[PDB]
Enzyme design. Sequence first.
Site, PDB file in Angstrom:
ATOM      1  N   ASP C  45       0.820  -1.204   0.000  1.00 59.38           N
ATOM      2  CA  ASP C  45       0.000   0.000   0.000  1.00 59.38           C
ATOM      3  C   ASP C  45       0.857   1.259   0.000  1.00 59.38           C
ATOM      4  O   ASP C  45       0.455   2.277  -0.574  1.00 59.38           O
ATOM      5  CB  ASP C  45      -0.944  -0.004   1.205  1.00 59.38           C
ATOM      6  CG  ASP C  45      -2.132  -0.928   1.017  1.00 59.38           C
ATOM      7  OD1 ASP C  45      -2.630  -1.041  -0.122  1.00 59.38           O
ATOM      8  OD2 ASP C  45      -2.575  -1.537   2.013  1.00 59.38           O
ATOM      9  N   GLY C  46       2.022   1.217   0.653  1.00 63.10           N
ATOM     10  CA  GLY C  46       2.941   2.340   0.571  1.00 63.10           C
ATOM     11  C   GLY C  46       3.357   2.637  -0.856  1.00 63.10           C
ATOM     12  O   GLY C  46       3.418   3.798  -1.268  1.00 63.10           O
ATOM     13  N   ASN C 164      -6.963   5.874  10.847  1.00 65.85           N
ATOM     14  CA  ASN C 164      -8.284   6.099  11.434  1.00 65.85           C
ATOM     15  C   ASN C 164      -8.757   4.912  12.259  1.00 65.85           C
ATOM     16  O   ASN C 164      -9.298   5.084  13.358  1.00 65.85           O
ATOM     17  CB  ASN C 164      -9.276   6.400  10.306  1.00 65.85           C
ATOM     18  CG  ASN C 164     -10.723   6.396  10.767  1.00 65.85           C
ATOM     19  OD1 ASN C 164     -11.254   7.429  11.180  1.00 65.85           O
ATOM     20  ND2 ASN C 164     -11.376   5.238  10.678  1.00 65.85           N
TER      21      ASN C 164
END
Lengths: 264, 264, 264, 264
Positions: C45-46, C164
């Site tokens: 994802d990076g 989050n």
Amino acid sequence: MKYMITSKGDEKSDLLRLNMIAGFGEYDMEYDDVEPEIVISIGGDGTFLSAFHQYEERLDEIAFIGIHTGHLGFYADWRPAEADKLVKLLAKGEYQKVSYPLLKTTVKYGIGKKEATYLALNESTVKSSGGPFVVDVVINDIHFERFRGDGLCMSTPSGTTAYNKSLGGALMHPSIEAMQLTEMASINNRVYRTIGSPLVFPKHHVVSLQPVNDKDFQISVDHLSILHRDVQEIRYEVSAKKIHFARFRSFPFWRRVHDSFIED
Amino acid sequence: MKYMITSKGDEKSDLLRLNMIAGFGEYDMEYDDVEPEIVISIGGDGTFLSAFHQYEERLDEIAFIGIHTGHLGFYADWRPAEADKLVKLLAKGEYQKVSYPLLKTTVKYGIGKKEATYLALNESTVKSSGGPFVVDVVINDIHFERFRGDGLCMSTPSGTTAYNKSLGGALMHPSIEAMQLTEMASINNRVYRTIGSPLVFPKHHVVSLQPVNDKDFQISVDHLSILHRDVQEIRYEVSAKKIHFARFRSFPFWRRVHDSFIED
Amino acid sequence: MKYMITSKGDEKSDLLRLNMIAGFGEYDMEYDDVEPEIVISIGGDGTFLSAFHQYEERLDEIAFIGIHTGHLGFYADWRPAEADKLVKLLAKGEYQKVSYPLLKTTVKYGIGKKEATYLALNESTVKSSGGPFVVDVVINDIHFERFRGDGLCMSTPSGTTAYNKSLGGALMHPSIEAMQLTEMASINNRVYRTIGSPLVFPKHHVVSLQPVNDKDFQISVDHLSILHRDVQEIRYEVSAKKIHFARFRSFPFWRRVHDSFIED
Amino acid sequence: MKYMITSKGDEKSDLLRLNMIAGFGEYDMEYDDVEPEIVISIGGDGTFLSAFHQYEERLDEIAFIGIHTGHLGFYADWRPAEADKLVKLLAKGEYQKVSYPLLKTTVKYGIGKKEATYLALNESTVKSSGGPFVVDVVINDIHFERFRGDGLCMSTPSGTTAYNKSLGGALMHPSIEAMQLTEMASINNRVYRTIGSPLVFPKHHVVSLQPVNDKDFQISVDHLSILHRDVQEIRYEVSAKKIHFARFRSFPFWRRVHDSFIED
Ligand SMILES: NCC(=O)NC[C@H]1O[C@@H](n2c(C#CCN(CC(=O)O)C[C@H]3O[C@@H](n4cnc5c(N)ncnc54)[C@H](O)[C@@H]3O)nc3c(N)ncnc32)[C@H](O)[C@@H]1O
Ligand SMILES: NCC(=O)NC[C@H]1O[C@@H](n2c(C#CCN(CC(=O)O)C[C@H]3O[C@@H](n4cnc5c(N)ncnc54)[C@H](O)[C@@H]3O)nc3c(N)ncnc32)[C@H](O)[C@@H]1O
Ligand SMILES: NCC(=O)NC[C@H]1O[C@@H](n2c(C#CCN(CC(=O)O)C[C@H]3O[C@@H](n4cnc5c(N)ncnc54)[C@H](O)[C@@H]3O)nc3c(N)ncnc32)[C@H](O)[C@@H]1O
Ligand SMILES: NCC(=O)NC[C@H]1O[C@@H](n2c(C#CCN(CC(=O)O)C[C@H]3O[C@@H](n4cnc5c(N)ncnc54)[C@H](O)[C@@H]3O)nc3c(N)ncnc32)[C@H](O)[C@@H]1O
């Protein structure tokens, strides 16, 4: 006997300090800020923490007292209006001391030995120096978890109402000789797992944080925060040392908690 | 000496029990389920809790042992494959006992006096009987808060990994003689305030719940849950009584926690 | 048409990239990393976030695809074994695009005007530059709260499973055009109050953070983190811009969530 | 036009109702509690919820207004002192209506077909009937998780400040057509896993709860709570129906939230 008074330094606290010094002058009380026997803090909890660390090498020879000039400080058990009663009962003495446990933090470095130890009244926390924070948590030499997240907080009992509380930690009565570890924003998915829950350790248990990749960490002890480089290990345990408070009347911890968070 | 074995009652646990009875028959071991000295539970943690409450009037004369036939039970420190080693080391004896603290619950009723006390190994909880749940929380005779929400949970140390954990409570090592109070869905707004945080109490502290409107509550003690009517007060304190475990090898609490929640 | 492939840079991802380039060579596919029309990210994802920010000025002309060479990346919807099927279906085309909302961050400075805007795919966060973090939170010009704590996180929908989530935020399906604000360790007592709960805002709502004392903040946008000085205001709103994904088969968001956090 | 007024029934609310009826008598306003066009609730949020469910078959033909005689009710946007201004502006009309989304709950039973549907303004919750609560959670026909715990809560947007908030849910602005699922004390260990985080669903998504062992559940819809037996399925989705409020001045949701939880 010998006493000293530290002040937050605003106009309100300096004047209260000067007035208390004048009142002490009417008794066999000698101002000495080198080897005091009573340390009075006038200000807030930040002022009291500085007072504690100012004299942490003579903890067993000192009784601390806090006056809150702002709102109720948690380590403050006196309002400014009662300062004269404080002078007088302190002058006569015959009070009783109460003791809260403290947290010992040991920081080991690489490139040889070398160690630094610190004492905490509220907590010690660990965060990374910019990159991701990854440490292995080792409890009594047993690998417990690999923590990935923002950081970790180890709290004393009287510290549990401070940073620990904001992290979801439990509030523990300070007669319990323990320390409490809380997570800061741990990642949890299929590959990364932490316990999540706060953990409460008794005396003689040792919690060791060990670096996995980066070896630089931002380490706090109460208000002091320092970047430590080439860190090999951070060890937490309940200190053998204790802070002593001078107590003149009953003000129970749970009432202190109620006044600070429920209503006053 | 005298021993007994309780079984979850499935085919797997009954057969393990019969095989252990046969193995004990080869030693000076006498089966007695009236005044046993060793109580072996074969099943899960639910089975072990029933074993505890079956003999809670002889706690100081009994050492408990748990075998988990399903996955690792928290009070189980033995797998079924090690049952023969268990028989043999138990037969020879020379083991050492470890003790965990317990929770005392006292329920006072109205229309006169009358009291009921219960002992809990995991926790005791209070909920309402249908309507809203509102109780005043009184700590050592000091009014602490008025709780409005779904209920309250008071946990022993070894209970902190059970219901307490799901409510956000801290995990505490069972050498700490304490009890921990956690909230179930408290309402917090401009008019209603609770502490929110779990609270950890030492021995000799008394936490009293007192009704505000409705006086009927659903009260649980471990697995048992009863509707209590005309309740005047519910009092929590750390029991003077303790449960004793027979220990044959090192299996630390924090490793038990790691195995149960991190990986095994 | 025109395509490009970014790689995490380890041996596994570079070779997959070279093999995909060779496979694309057998079709009317032209490698162009200046104005590509398909952007393939090979890594984690990076890697995908860097790919997004590499081309964030041509978002409406690009469809993104992610391949995870490690474990399942949340923005990766392809395994390396399916890379040839990817080449072929991409070569033929006829796929359909899906769009996720984005977060606009505007940073206003003092000593005159000057503004910087950033686009976030996961989130933007604000922390202090060393001292205490205190900001006034203003929602649609209405003073909502004064936040004291470690920081604040504003998440996109697809970001809600990232930082989050670790902060206690809700997971929201990315068809909802919204942004979600979560607290980092707020202090709450008699004098300091925040809402506590995560807050979810629709399009056209503007959340403004305004300094109270210190005006220096550490501001992150996805992986990028910069110290901003002389900051007057930080404004959050749902962007009018969206990221487009090339989709070849059904892989629902809630199944993606299940695979990433429950089991796979 | 036609209007009616429901009252909490205490002395304060009955008299306000009678005085408003007298004031309406001076205009072309006709009292009709069968097919009203304006429904005024005088009391608290509980009173307003009863008013909503009293007329939930004529939602699209009614505009609701709430007066709080106690503290600020969340659905109350009027104080008793402004009741005369309310009569007058209502009498003249020309107000604008605002609409909040609603939650549809469908309960399917066994031993044949049969279905019951309910509409919720705050939330619908599911708990067990005494024993353990275990349900499979199925999102759009995709098995998402097996939930073990105390229960589940599905909230509307305007409901997110109620039970949902106490369970850790996010607060969402009511212009977002969504519903939010929150856990009540889920168990999480090596064998049992839930997502933990609240989940936010858009319109047209269907969340189905399906029994695993026991098929009896306590199901709430706002204030109403019923034991349902032989339940085959509980289905949640955002309703096509909406509740309409009569609005006379600006009182933003986030200001309503601020007044209710931060300060007023
Ligand atoms: N500018 C003064 C300020 O508002 N500081 C913190 C507030 O917390 C109170 N407080 C303190 C204290 C203190 C002094 N400060 C400042 C200084 O020393 O300058 C250092 C401590 O900061 C805490 N802290 C840091 N980050 C957070 C955070 N995110 N959330 C919550 N607390 C946080 C840590 O624990 C530090 O030890 N100890 C306790 C206690 N025992 N019980 C209950 N309350 C306590 C103070 O009365 C004050 O209301
Ligand atoms: N059908 C058996 C089942 O799954 N039961 C509970 C699960 O929890 C484990 N567990 C138990 C236990 C037990 C036995 N049960 C059942 C029985 O007795 O029949 C009663 C207890 O239920 C707990 N409980 C109730 N509600 C919830 C909830 N919402 N969330 C979490 N736990 C909850 C309470 O605390 C009761 O005491 N004590 C501990 C412990 N000490 N440490 C760690 N884990 C523990 C069990 O291995 C099992 O995995
Ligand atoms: N070294 C790689 C690494 O482990 N990074 C983070 C992990 O999170 C996953 N993840 C990412 C990602 C990513 C890339 N990273 C790294 C990089 O870009 O180098 C930046 C993001 O970091 C997040 N993050 C920061 N702090 C925390 C924290 N305390 N807790 C949780 N997440 C945190 C922020 O949100 C950043 O945006 N986006 C999502 C998503 N949408 N859904 C679900 N999962 C997601 C990654 O698969 C990986 O497992
Ligand atoms: N005796 C009256 C009472 O104090 N009731 C609840 C309180 O909550 C407020 N409130 C309500 C309401 C209401 C009416 N009640 C009572 C009735 O109808 O009699 C039913 C609702 O109860 C909620 N509730 C149940 N359990 C819990 C719990 N554990 N924690 C928090 N809330 C809980 C559920 O959601 C029900 O729908 N809707 C909202 C809203 N939208 N926004 C913000 N606040 C709201 C009320 O002003 C009142 O302050």
